[PDB]
Structures are given as structure tokens and as C-alpha cells.
Symmetry: C3
Amino acid sequence: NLYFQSMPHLVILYSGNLDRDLDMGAVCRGLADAMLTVRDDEGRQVFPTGGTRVLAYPAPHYAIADGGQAGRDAGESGDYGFAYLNLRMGRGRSEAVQRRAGETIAQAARALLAPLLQQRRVGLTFQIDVGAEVYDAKFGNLHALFQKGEK
Amino acid sequence: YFQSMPHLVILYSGNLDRDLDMGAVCRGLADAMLTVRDDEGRQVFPTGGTRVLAYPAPHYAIADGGQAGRDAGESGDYGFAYLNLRMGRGRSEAVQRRAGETIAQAARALLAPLLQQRRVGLTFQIDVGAEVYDAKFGNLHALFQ
Amino acid sequence: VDLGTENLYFQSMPHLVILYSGNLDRDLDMGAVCRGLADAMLTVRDDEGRQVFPTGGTRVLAYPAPHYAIADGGQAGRDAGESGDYGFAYLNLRMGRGRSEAVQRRAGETIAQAARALLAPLLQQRRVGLTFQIDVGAEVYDAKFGNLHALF
């Protein structure tokens, strides 16, 4: 159903140390922009503009891999980072369309997060989940700005 | 047992904090959850297991980034909140829907003043936990036995 | 029968997220809890003595919530002569598909036992709800694109 696909949310969970030399707000906007470019084989927009949201949360407490040992042993700082990107999309789409959306967003993420790779060792992971919710309600007023109307 | 850990998480844009007491919203939603009853006369979400947690996001991008808002003569500074209830397996579709309607109504009432201040997308979903392992190990439940 | 090697791709991204009430930050160093849990994860072995959770892919994150409501809001605690200032921590491990029930249970037991040990001082001075769940990832798409893996 199109209803099930009307609420795509991408959440970024990342180690707080990444805030040092990257504008995460700009990364959010870049990823949102990337989602909005995705078209199916019929030319339909896969992620509707009105329902798209990207949000990012720096974790104040974290443990990554071995805690730095391998890094320090290799003559590096051992100060690791990570970012985990999760897109929750609606049911009903083919694997090919899911993988197209995945590839497009992943390539955008690679480009936007590229500066991080120069600064430290960083794990970067992106997953797409399909929502299996048993109840849905939309009740905001944002949708009103994306309704059709000739002036 | 699967239903003994009812968990409501709110992910929302940090800009909402200016126009909202999010602690009061959490309390209101928790109160609403405690009112949900099945057709066997039982409280659906146990008091001892009920938790509502809310997280303001410091970084976010919403919809077109503001253009549609500006075209309507507004600021285009959008907000959003996403509410997710993770409940246990083994409940009827009727009970799941009753839970959803009760919580959605509470959310509509609690967030009505916010909708007067900003364009805000508001979404609420109920997921049923599909976990392969569960452990409960706190001392909070002891107060409700 | 455990099918870890057959599902190798899906085994490289185990992450444990902790969502907890912000008041717990007054009671303990949550960073030390994360480290202790990561240490515990790396100890889990399958029936061959192989590491279930790869070191390079192991991630533990903890998020204090600034706004929360727990249980009855303190009444039962105050009635029992306590503060009624409750806490809660919810721990969720997302692991890969294709593992045996026994491997899932071993992972659960090892991590739960570590969590009980690390969070025990909390229980001495506060009423805290503590829940741990393991979910199996059912993602339809993955991408791995960091530079951390090279060290491992």
C-alpha cells in the first residue's frame, strides 16, 4: 500500500566524537535530498516529500570494537568512531526497488561522510528495514503543505 | 510475560522543546497507556513495566527543507515527532487497535497546542516485539507485586 | 543447526543499543557499562569455538533520555518509604540471521549475566526497571563503508 510507504524515517545513531569535524545537520539534509531522488521503473517517487524525515543522534556513551587496542598497536590513536544509518520504509516494494533505493542512499552517505574517513577509524553501516507495524496513525499538520491546490 | 515490558519511545526534532513540556507529554502518554483494558477486565500494560522515553534530535532534515512552508507564507521551519510503541505478542487485533486508539487520542490532545505554533509531522506506530531472547532483571517490579 | 558461516554477510554488524532514563547518569558511568558489555559480547563462542560477534563489527551505544515517565510516577515508591524516583534501562542487541536457538540463548545468557553484574550498583540505591532483548535483523538491504574493518 501507498499508505504504508508514506512515513519513511531515516535515523542515524553515531558516536559523539564524530561531531568534532563534520556538520551532521548537513549530512541529514544531504541524505533527505538523496531519498527524494529515488524513482521506480515507472518514474514514481519512492519516498514522498511530505513524509520524509532524517534525524541524527550523537551517543554520549559507547564502546567500539576492541576499545582502541588494535589501533594503538598499529601506531594509531585508537580513537574509533562509528555511524549506523537505519531507513525504515513501507511494505509492498520489490527487492530490486529496495536495492536501488539502498544503493542511491548509500552512495550519498559515502560522499557526505567521506571527511570522517580522513580523521579516524570509523565503522559506517547502513540498513533498510521494512515496517511490520500493526497500528499506524498520522496526526500532524505538516501534510497540509504538500496537498494539491491551484491558486 | 512477553507483554510485561511495554515500551514507548518518542523521537522528535529538538526545535519542539521551545513550545512543549516533553516531560508532561511523556507522563500524559504513560497515564493513557495505563487506562487500556482488554475484554477480560485486565489492564493491558502493567504499571510496573510501563516506560515512556523521549529523545530530542539535535540534527534533522524534514520534507523539502522549508520551501512549501515559505510558499504558504510561513517560516518553513518544520518539526516532527515519531512515536513508537513496542508491545508484546499474543494480543488480539481488537486489543492492539484499542491500545492504538487510546494512545493516539492522548497524543492528539497533548500535542494540540504545539500544532498551533509550528508545522509538525506526527506519526505513531505500534510494533509487536519479535525478539528471540528476553531477560528482565531490575527491582522496579517488586514495588508492584 | 547453526548456520553462521553460511550467513557470514549478516554476522558482521552486531549492535547493542541501550535506551535509559537520564537520571541514571547520576548513579554510574554508562561508558564503563558499554565497555563491559562489549567485552562480554566478544566472549561468546559457537559450538566450534568460533567468535559469534566479530570484534571489528561489535558496537555498544547508550542514550540517556532527558524526558521520561516510568510506572506510576513515584506513588508506590513513596508509599513504601522510598524516593519514588524510578529509573529504567532497555538493552537491545540486534544480531544476524541463521544462528541456532542454542547460540542465540548462549549470547542472551552471557550478555544478560554481564548486564546484571554491571548494573547491580544501580539497584542498591534506586528502583530501576531493566530489560534486555535480542532481535534478529530482517533488513532487506545492507551497506558497509567505513575504514574500521581494516584493523581486524
